[PDB]
Design a protein around this ligand. Structure first.
Ligand code: HEM
Ligand SMILES: C[C@H](Cc1ccccc1)N=O
Length: 153
């Protein structure tokens, strides 16, 4: 369970993300696809992209970046009260997309890396710890849902 102070460190960096969610989402998905290229194979729309330049030019990847971060943002804003948001996400990621928990760890790492690079003003050690704790909570709850849904993750 996060404290309110922890949640406020999360939401104060999120506020900066939201100056330009598309740009943040592009950087985060590119980081994921560069650090763990195997993750690209989950995407019919993107498994063909060969280079960071191709990724940066992809309007579909930019839209995806907006989607992921907006959905995550809505979860974070619930401050742990996110059962309703996690239901459809778990179901789609478990059953249709087949996203293992390891890959949710990889995108969490990508988010942290990008925020640390972009936002040293709002992503010092305390703030990074709070974001890691929010992301770990998210992954714990999603994994519990995966199990309920019949997917080992
Ligand atoms: C913070 C974690 C994540 C959030 C909040 C998130 C959110 C979403 C949302 C809102 C959609 C669209 C609706 C849906 O299909 O449920 C979606 C689609 C998808 N997500 Fe995620 N996602 C997350 C992580 C991941 C990861 C790590 C992967 C793969 C490595 C992944 C793969 C996909 C795929 C394959 C689709 C469908 C793509 C398509 O229609 O072209 N997601 N995600
Ligand atoms: C990471 C993945 C990105 C995505 C979301 C929506 C459409 C395509 C790709 N999940 O949000």
């Amino acid at each position: 369970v996060l404290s309110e102070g922890e949640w406020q460190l999360v939401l104060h960096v999120w506020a900066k993300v939201e100056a330009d969610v598309a740009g943040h989402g592009q950087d985060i998905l590119i980081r994921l696809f560069k650090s763990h290229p195997e993750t690209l194979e989950k995407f019919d729309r993107f498994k063909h992209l060969k280079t960071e330049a191709e990724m940066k030019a992809s309007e579909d990847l930019k839209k995806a970046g907006v989607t992921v971060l907006t959905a995550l943002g809505a979860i974070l804003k619930k401050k742990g009260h996110h059962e309703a948001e996690l239901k459809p996400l778990a179901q789609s990621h478990a059953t249709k997309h087949k996203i293992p928990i390891k890959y949710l760890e990889f995108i969490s790492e990508a988010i942290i890396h990008v925020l640390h690079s972009r936002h040293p003003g709002n992503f010092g050690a305390d703030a990074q710890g709070a974001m890691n704790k929010a992301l770990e909570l998210f992954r714990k709850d999603i994994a519990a849902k995966y199990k309920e849904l019949g997917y080992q993750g």
